[PDB]
Write an enzyme that holds these catalytic residues in place. Structure first.
Site, PDB file in Angstrom:
ATOM      1  N   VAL A 196       0.835  -1.430   0.106  1.00  0.00           N
ATOM      2  CA  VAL A 196      -0.006  -0.110   0.004  1.00  0.00           C
ATOM      3  C   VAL A 196       0.908   1.093   0.008  1.00  0.00           C
ATOM      4  CG1 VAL A 196      -1.815   1.256   1.094  1.00  0.00           C
ATOM      5  CG2 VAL A 196      -1.903  -1.259   1.390  1.00  0.00           C
ATOM      6  N   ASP A 197       2.229   1.089   0.005  1.00  0.00           N
ATOM      7  CA  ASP A 197       3.048   2.324  -0.011  1.00  0.00           C
ATOM      8  C   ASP A 197       3.246   2.584  -1.515  1.00  0.00           C
ATOM      9  OD1 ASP A 197       4.968   4.103   1.553  1.00  0.00           O
ATOM     10  OD2 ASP A 197       6.339   2.795   0.066  1.00  0.00           O
ATOM     11  N   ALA A 198       3.104   1.896  -2.451  1.00  0.00           N
ATOM     12  CA  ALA A 198       3.169   2.354  -3.802  1.00  0.00           C
ATOM     13  C   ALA A 198       1.838   2.830  -4.378  1.00  0.00           C
ATOM     14  CB  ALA A 198       3.570   1.040  -4.653  1.00  0.00           C
ATOM     15  N   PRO A 249      -0.151   4.878  -2.861  1.00  0.00           N
ATOM     16  CA  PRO A 249      -0.441   6.304  -2.796  1.00  0.00           C
ATOM     17  C   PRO A 249       0.261   7.195  -3.826  1.00  0.00           C
ATOM     18  CG  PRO A 249       0.165   5.000  -1.034  1.00  0.00           C
ATOM     19  CD  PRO A 249       0.809   4.198  -2.016  1.00  0.00           C
TER      20      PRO A 249
END
Lengths: 142, 79, 79, 79, 79, 79, 79, 79, 79, 79, 79, 79, 79
Positions: free
Chosen positions: K60-62, K64
């Site tokens: 979920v870090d990508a 965004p």
């Protein structure tokens, strides 16, 4: 074997070597006082080989002192000294050729003008390497 | 030409000498370390260590040292 | 041409030698050190011979690039 | 064209060889060292043969890029 | 166009091969070395066959990029 | 000329010293640290003397490049 | 446009393939080697099948970027 | 001249100090850490004294380049 | 605009895919290998299912950036 | 001059501080971590004092470059 | 402006996503793998839940940066 | 001037903060993780206090560069 | 000005966020993973709370740079 015995010759050798470096600088400085010919080319060209000859001569002098020491004995301690000489010897040779050519180029009267800076600079570099050698020897002896 | 010449030339001495000189120093440290372990591990070659250390070192430096003398001999000299 | 020529040529012997010579130095340090670890316990008779073959194989990896850099460089000398 | 040509060409043999030759040197150091660790205990008969095959396979990884860099370089020579 | 063309094209075979060839060399060193560690104890019959398959699979990773760099390069040759 | 001259010259003493001085610092750290490991157990009489010889040999690897960078730099001063 | 076009396009297949192909090679070396370590002891029946699936999955990571680089490249060919 | 002068000069103290200062910091970390490992067990009397000599020798490797960068920088100040 | 446009756009799909695809490949190698180590001993029933979920999750990290690079690329196609 | 001046000056405090500050941070992490390992078992009385001296010596390696970058920067402020 | 605008903007979503997405992928591989090692022995009930939270937190870090790169990109679309 | 000014200034807070902030983050990860290893067994009373001091000391290494980048940035705001 | 302005500004939020966000992601992976290792055996009550504090402290290291990049970016929006 002998305390003051070994010390007297070893001490003499170190003093002579330092003197030898000064002597090399002395030969060219002495030479300028008396001039004769100066065609720019031949003069400077003659000088570069002469500088090379002087460095070789200094090395020969060192060899002579070592041989004498061996003869007196009967009818490392030396390895470290040799190493210091090699580092200084390489730098001095490079300095003498490069410094002399550069000194001549900057001024017009390469004669005296080149000699004062070239001579002083070469002596200083050799002295610095020699100074390092002196500190190492003293620390070893305690 | 003359511009990039004198610039490339000088930079050559610096790049060449510093690169080969560094390569030299490092190796002395590299081979010297390993060598020492071996030459020293040996029966009685400890003195060999130093005796050959000075020679192996100088011979390693003699390279850029030769390039400097030989280099400037015709570089800074003959220009 | 002649501009980027002597510029690329020289930069070649510096980029070439510096790059291959360094690759050599490191290897000698890599192969030399690692090799010893895989034969340090055993006698210094057989591995000492093989060890040199390596450290040297690395000490000979720079010698070529240099001779090559020197060549391309000596080429410029021909003009 | 001719400008970036001889510029890229030369830079090719330097970028090529320096890059493949280094990739070679390292490997020889990587494969050579690592391989030994996985066969250092065993006799030096079988692994010694396989070991060379590796270190050499790496010593032959530069030889090509070089011959290639030399070729592209020799090409420029043809003009 | 033609300028950046032959410039990018050549730089392609150098960037391509140097980049894939190096990726190949390393792998051969990575897969080759690591693989051995995971089958060094066992006989050199089965793993020796699988081992080659790897080190070779890596020795064949450069061969393509090269043939490709050579192609794109040979293309420029067609003009 | 004079432009790239003083530009290359200065950049020389920075590229030279920074490059040789760093090569010096590292070595002192490499040779100095590694050397200790190969003589840390033994008394601090003999190795302490040899240890300095190394760490110093490295502390003297920068001193030259600097004196050299300072020289070439002092040369520019002559104009 | 057309200039940076064919320039970026080509550089694409080199930046693309070289970048994905290398990512492929490494993986094959990473996944391939690491995987073996986590199944080297067990028989070469099940893991050998899964092992290939990995090393291959990596050997197929370059094949696409290449086909893609080749495509974008072949596109330029259409003009 | 004056342009690349003050440009190279300043960049000198940044390239010089940043490069020698970093070489210093690292060493202090390399020599300092490695040294401790080779004398951490022994009392903190003798090694503590030698340890400082190192970490400091490194803490003094930046101080010079800085004084040098500051000098060359202060030189520009003279105009 | 249109110049840096098609230039940045294309370079996008190469910088994007090459950068995300590589991030994908590595992960598959990182997560895939590391995961196995933390579940290699256990049966290949449960972990084999979870293992794929990872290696695949990584094999799907490139697929998007690509579809994205392909999109932005296909956009340029629209003109 | 004035252009590359304020340009080099500012870039100095960023190149300087960023470069020395980072060299500081790392060291604190290198010397700090490594030091602890060589004195983690012993009481937190003596090493805790020496430990701070290090981590701090590193926390003070950035403070100077910064004060220096700030100075050169504040200099520009004088105009 | 408009030139470097659409140029920087696009390059943003590529530099942004490629940089954050990769930071994401790696983490998922770092946190995901490392986490498992610190809870691989225990049942797959509690850690399996926490494990996903991590690998996902990375997955979920990508998402965004992408939505962000897509936004800034979609912004350009508005013109 | 004013051009490279606001250009270098802004790039400063990005190069500065990004460079010092990252140096901070890493440290917190380096010092924080390494520190724990050297005091994880002991109670979470004393080390927990010292541990924070570190991870925080690192969490405060970015805060300054930022406030500094923000300042230099806020300076531009003054015009 | 306005040119390098919006160019540097945008590039700021990409260089800033991408650089701090990545520094964040990594940390979360570094601190998060390393922390667990130093408290994986103990119950998941106390360390689970401290563990989050870390992984989150890292998950909050990007959030700021982003809000900052978003701000500087939103600033450009004001024109």
């Amino acid at each position: 074997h002998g305390k003051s015995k070994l010390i007297a010759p070893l001490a003499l050798t170190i003093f002579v070597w330092v003197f030898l470096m000064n002597l090399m600088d002395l030969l060219p400085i002495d030479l300028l006082p008396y001039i004769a010919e100066h065609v720019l080319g031949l003069p400077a060209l003659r000088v570069v080989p002469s500088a090379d000859v002087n460095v070789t001569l200094s090395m020969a002098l060192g060899v002579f002192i070592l041989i004498l020491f061996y003869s007196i004995k009967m009818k490392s301690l030396l390895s470290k000294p040799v190493s210091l000489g090699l580092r200084l010897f390489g730098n001095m040779y490079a300095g003498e050729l490069i410094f002399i050519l550069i000194a001549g180029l900057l001024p017009w009267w390469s004669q005296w003008i080149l000699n004062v800076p070239w001579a002083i600079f070469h002596i200083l570099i050799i002295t610095l390497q020699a100074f390092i050698f002196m500190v190492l020897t003293i620390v070893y002896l305690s | 030409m003359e511009n990039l010449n004198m610039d490339l030339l000088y930079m050559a001495a610096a790049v060449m000498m510093g690169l080969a000189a560094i390569g030299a120093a490092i190796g002395i440290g590299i081979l010297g370390g390993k060598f020492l372990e071996g030459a020293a591990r040996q029966p009685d070659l400890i003195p060999l260590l130093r005796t050959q250390f000075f020679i192996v070192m100088g011979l390693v430096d003699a390279i850029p040292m030769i390039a400097v003398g030989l280099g400037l001999y015709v570089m800074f000299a003959v220009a």
